[PDB]
From Swiss-Prot:
The lineage of its organism: Eukaryota, Metazoa, Chordata, Craniata, Vertebrata. The chain holds residues 2895 to 3337 of 4967 of the full protein. The gene is RYR2. Channel activity is modulated by phosphorylation. Phosphorylation is increased in failing heart, leading to calcium leaks and increased cytoplasmic Ca(2+) levels. It is linked to Ventricular tachycardia, catecholaminergic polymorphic, 1, with or without atrial dysfunction and/or dilated cardiomyopathy: An arrhythmogenic disorder characterized by stress-induced, bidirectional ventricular tachycardia that may degenerate into cardiac arrest and cause sudden death. Patients present with recurrent syncope, seizures, or sudden death after physical activity or emotional stress. CPVT1 inheritance is autosomal dominant. Ventricular arrhythmias due to cardiac ryanodine receptor calcium release deficiency syndrome: An autosomal dominant arrhythmogenic disorder characterized by syncope, cardiac arrest and/or sudden unexpected death, often in association with physical exertion or acute emotional stress. Patients who survive manifest polymorphic ventricular tachycardia and ventricular fibrillation. Unlike typical catecholaminergic ventricular tachycardia, arrhythmias are not reproducible on exercise stress testing or adrenaline challenge. It is found in: Sarcoplasmic reticulum membrane. It comes from Homo sapiens. It comes from the Eukaryota. This is Ryanodine receptor 2. Belongs to the ryanodine receptor (TC 1.A.3.1) family. RYR2 subfamily. The calcium release channel activity resides in the C-terminal region while the remaining part of the protein resides in the cytoplasm.
Amino acid sequence: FLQINGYAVSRGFKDLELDTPSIEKRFAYSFLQQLIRYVDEAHQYILEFDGGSRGKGEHFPYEQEIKFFAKVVLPLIDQYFKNHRLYFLSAASRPLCSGGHASNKEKEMVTSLFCKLGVLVRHRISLFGNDATSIVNCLHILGQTLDARTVMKTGLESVKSALRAFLDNAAEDLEKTMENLKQGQFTKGVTQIINYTTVALLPMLSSLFEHIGQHQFGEDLILEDVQVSCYRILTSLYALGTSKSIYVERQRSALGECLAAFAGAFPVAFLETHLDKHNIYSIYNTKSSRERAALSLPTNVEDVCPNIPSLEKLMEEIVELAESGIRYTQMPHVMEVILPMLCSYMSRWWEHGPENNPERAEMCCTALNSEHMNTLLGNILKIIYNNLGIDEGAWMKRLAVFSQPIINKVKPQLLKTHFLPLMEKLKKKAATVVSEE
């Protein structure tokens, strides 16, 4: 009857204010407020427990709080960042273009939570018994969702300094692992540091750097002193790969993948240091020797990676190994480690090579010629041919999956007449479990 008279029944009032652009009230914003506050709360508690445990206070005053943290906060973070992955990943770079700002401040708190979770996971795998796996899974699932683009171009200084302090502390801890396993090689703080490194630092660092390489985040992440932190990381990782000890023999497998991820994430040709002064983006050109005089830099291109060989010397060594065909046990170094180095390196540097830009050639940085990619693919093939039947292994498989990106360069039709011997030998020795291609 109201209708037929035309009386206009109306929504009770009229909106006085609408604050939709306010990022400060959104679900993600508040959720990360709460997550950050409980992470920091876990931090004063655990750092209090650091003094309580060595003292009389054996019984944990806040056992309920720490159990709540370790059994609720971490798995919910894992599930949330597994579900809403592309939400934070979209930074106007075209992923999830159908919609999906996480905003600048959301990405900023994501990165801050990442750094704070790293601070918590520092040297506490034993303290976080049976859940350090949960922490490190959270680190994987958050580092794979970082937004280094936005973090560097528009971020707040505490978060920026936290990210570089995180990187510097990781480099320092792994360096400390380096010298402590060098000096205590003859038969525990050193053992605890080694366990921390193997449990957390390698899988974490591998995940972070593969994420960076796949999202091309190294072009804006690693410029200012992050370059030198990464050089220290590379030198240490290569030194640990060169170290021969039963302590490292069973962690070599993760080391190769971690350093391959590093090579794919790092934006300056560390194997062609004789031509790095062609790189505009290089820290050596950006800050110059005038600031190397002030900074704690070796002021030299080659001496920053002394024990790391050059690209030409690496090719020489591994081709020589290709005709030699030694057994895996005699020298597991190059077999286990060196090939993924060069695979990731050349896969990253192929587009920065001169073929993609025939113009402005020879002022370039990575002289990776089609013959050079063919040579590296072919000598990997020859290695797998002359070492296929000697006890094989899963290192065979990871070699194949690291050669996966390299195969894209060589077309399958040109691959014939030198891949055919592999097919012929597979027909001759079909009693095998390992398969390729």
